[PDB]
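ARCHIVE CARD
CATEGORY: sequence design from structure
SOURCE FIELD: tokenized fold
FIELD CONTENT:
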């Protein structure tokens, strides 16, 4: 299977919106990650492309080129390959050590701060969208449901993303307006909890009960593994159900657990 200079190889991931295949560029003897889409709706794809084109940061995946033939049902987004893949699988019985979690969380902070400075809300932060690069550092992937805003913050009313990572203020049964940056912070807190415990803090196979726990169940830390108190403080602050008192990224950067 060829597509201009690219040979499609085996699958390497299903994010949101498509499937990703390893791809060999015969012109430069280099592997890439190719997202393949079947037109099934397409406005959102070209907004992801437009967002990706604006971004250039070591902790954000790099869109290389787009292959769109109007006579083809398939549309191809070529990314730079992130050779080591997602930072971890959730759930797992072998979570990261605190020191490993901090190393990756520092990259996540820098990438989110950059995205927000670029006026992008990611909306799907989770470990499987955090890819480990050649040098061991994280690259944030999958902008399939990201939002671009004008002004100081996004003012949003739509519910998108991965259910276990959705912030409780996005789960009102009344299309209320909520702000964007705090959504990414919440998902960062669920992500950090996942790093050290290997499962999400709020879990239910019944989607109604999952929504209800995100919105109303107090955060509980397992007895094991035994994590430091300042890490518990940081996670608690990011998983503040009230978005107005939830910790903000300029504070996360300063948090004692982050800086030691
Ligand atoms: C650039 C890139 N790589 C991948 C996947 C992998 C990658 O690169 N090495 C890997 C090594 C092992 C497993 C997956 C991967 C994805 C999902 C994306 C982004 C796709 C997107 O943003 O929608
Ligand atoms: Cl995940």
């Amino acid at each position: 299977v060829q597509l201009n200079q690219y040979t499609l190889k085996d699958e390497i991931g299903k994010g949101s919106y498509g499937v990703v295949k390893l791809a060999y560029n015969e012109n430069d003897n280099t592997y890439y990650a190719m997202k393949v889409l079947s037109k099934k709706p397409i406005e959102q794809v070209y907004q992801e492309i437009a967002i990706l084109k604006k971004l250039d940061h070591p902790n954000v995946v790099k869109l290389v080129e787009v292959l769109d033939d109007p006579n083809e049902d398939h549309l191809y987004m070529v990314f730079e390959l992130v050779n080591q893949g997602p930072v971890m699988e959730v759930p797992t019985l072998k979570p990261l050590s605190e020191d490993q979690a901090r190393f990756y969380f520092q990259d996540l902070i820098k990438g989110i701060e950059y995205l927000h400075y670029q006026k992008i809300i990611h909306r799907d932060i989770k470990p499987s969208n955090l890819l480990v690069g050649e040098d061991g550092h994280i690259k944030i992937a999958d902008f399939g449901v990201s939002n671009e805003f004008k002004g100081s913050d996004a003012l949003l009313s739509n519910t998108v993303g991965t259910p276990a990572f959705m912030a409780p203020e996005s789960l009102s049964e009344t299309r209320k307006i909520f702000s964007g940056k705090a959504l990414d912070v919440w998902a960062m807190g669920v992500t950090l909890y996942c790093f050290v415990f290997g499962q999400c803090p709020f879990m239910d196979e019944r989607i109604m009960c999952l929504h209800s726990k995100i919105k109303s169940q107090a955060l509980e830390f397992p007895d094991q593994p035994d994590i430091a108190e300042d890490l518990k403080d940081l996670i608690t602050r990011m998983l503040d159900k009230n978005p107005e008192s939830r910790i903000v990224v300029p504070e996360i950067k300063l948090h004692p657990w982050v800086t030691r």
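CARD ANNOTATION: The chain has two domains: 1-81, 82-260. The chain is about 30% helix and 20% strand.
SHELF: design records, drawer C
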